[PDB]
Amino acid sequence: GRGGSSTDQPVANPYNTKEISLAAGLVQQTYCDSTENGLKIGDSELLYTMGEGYARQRVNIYHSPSLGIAVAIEGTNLFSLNSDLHDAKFWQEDPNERYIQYYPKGTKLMHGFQQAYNDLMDDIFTAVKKYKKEKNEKRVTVIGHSLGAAMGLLCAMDIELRMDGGLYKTYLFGLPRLGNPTFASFVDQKIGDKFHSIINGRDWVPTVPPRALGYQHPSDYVWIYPGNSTSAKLYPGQENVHGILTVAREFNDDDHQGIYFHTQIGAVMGECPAQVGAH
Ligand SMILES: *[C@@H]1O[C@H](CO)[C@@H](O[C@@H]2O[C@H](CO)[C@@H](O[C@@H]3O[C@H](CO)[C@@H](O)[C@H](O)[C@@H]3O)[C@H](O)[C@H]2NC(C)=O)[C@H](O)[C@H]1NC(C)=O
Ligand SMILES: [Cl-]
């Protein structure tokens, strides 16, 4: 359902921290030149890349024994998230024609995120199907960070709804809000068992766009607190009141570009190639 604010207390982190650490590396690498044929990141082999973070986010496709076909989506600042929240990029709109028929009536998505996913979605589908066939791999894992984490949530839903065999898991780092309460509860219904939002320390990105604009996160996140530490808890339900707003955010991108279970997602000025478990 729609628009709540869970009051449940946090619980121990139940997510696989090795998978998280890996997924963090796989997405860090989308901030890097990714043309090296067969590059290995953690357990995974890079198979394909498209985009470079100029007209479109860079997307990397890997095969992984633990995660299957892994699609990681870059989160560079194609537009600014921390500024001018009245702008067109933040407006709510109907789902794009490609997948609107799969969504409940009244579903709304943020224009900026949806447009950026739509520039990639057909290319992503084509490549995923190619590499699932080539690797005899049914599992599809979708990973994103920053802008690419909201894009990643849209993509993860798109794969579950539209691709044969659906979604295995999604790992989303520093996830902005993407859709309205109707969207958010459809995420719970369709991929709730498969959804992993990871928030590091004082990261501001999960507070935007604001709820007052009609935006709502899906249920559950793991909050690493302190930022860059190995301490984390899960905050159940949508928009848990005991979570991130109980601790002062920061305006900068330090924790956003921090250390997630020993892997840095430093973004453009981070590690290239990515370094799984280097911290
Ligand atoms: C969590 O770890 C991240 C790195 O993954 C830390 O982010 C970094 O924070 C520093 C400030 O503390 C940023 O400032 C710059 O540092 C560089 C290198 O030390 C320096 O040459 C610059 O002049 C500037 O001072 C740094 O850019 C930033 N790194 C990234 C990739 O964003 C973050 O501070 C850590 N959090 C905590 C609570 O310690
Ligand atoms: Cl590009």
Closest-lying ligand 1 atom to the alpha carbon of residue 270: 31
* Nearest alpha-carbon partner for 107 in 211, 180, 187: 180
Q: What is the rounded distance in angstroms from the CA atom of residue 141 to the CA atom of residue 128?
A: 10
The number of the ligand nearest the C-alpha atom of 116 reads 2
Report the CATH number that the domain containing residue 96 is assigned in CATH: 3.40.50.1820
Closest-lying ligand 1 atom to the alpha carbon of residue 264: 5
Other Cβ atoms within 10 Å of 274 Cβ, number: 27
In eight-state DSSP terms, residue 16 is -
* Nearest alpha-carbon partner for 95 in 217, 180, 176: 180
Tokens representing 19? 């998978």
CA 258–ligand 1 middle distance (angstroms) = 8
* CA 44 to chain CA centroid, nearest Å: 18
Query: Which residues span the domain enclosing 161?
Result: 1-279
Pairing mode of beta strands 140-145, 68-73: parallel
Mutate to test the pocket of ligand 1, among 205, 250, 254 (most ligand atoms within 8 A of CB): 254
Residue 209 preceded by cis peptide, ω within 30:
yes
Q: What are the contacts of 184-187 at 24+ separation with CB within 8 A? A: 184/2, 184/216, 184/217, 184/218, 184/219, 184/238, 185/1, 185/2, 185/218, 185/238, 186/103, 186/104, 186/107, 186/157, 187/153, 187/157, 187/218, 187/219
User: Atom 6 (ligand 1): residue with closest C-alpha?
Assistant: 254
User: Atom 29 (ligand 1): residue with closest C-alpha?
Assistant: 254
The number of the ligand nearest the C-alpha atom of 76 reads 2
Task: Ligand 1: list residues with CB < 6 Å.
Answer: 201, 227-228, 253-255, 257-259, 264, 266, 269-270
CA 8–ligand 1 middle distance (angstroms) = 33
Contact 245, 208 (CB under 8 A): no
Technique that determined the structure: X-ray
The number of the ligand nearest the C-alpha atom of 57 reads 2
CA 245–ligand 2 middle distance (angstroms) = 35
CA 121–ligand 2 middle distance (angstroms) = 14
- Beta pairing partners, 264: 259
Query: What is the number of domains present in the chain?
Result: 1
- Sign (positive or negative) of CA dihedral 257, 259, 264, 269: positive
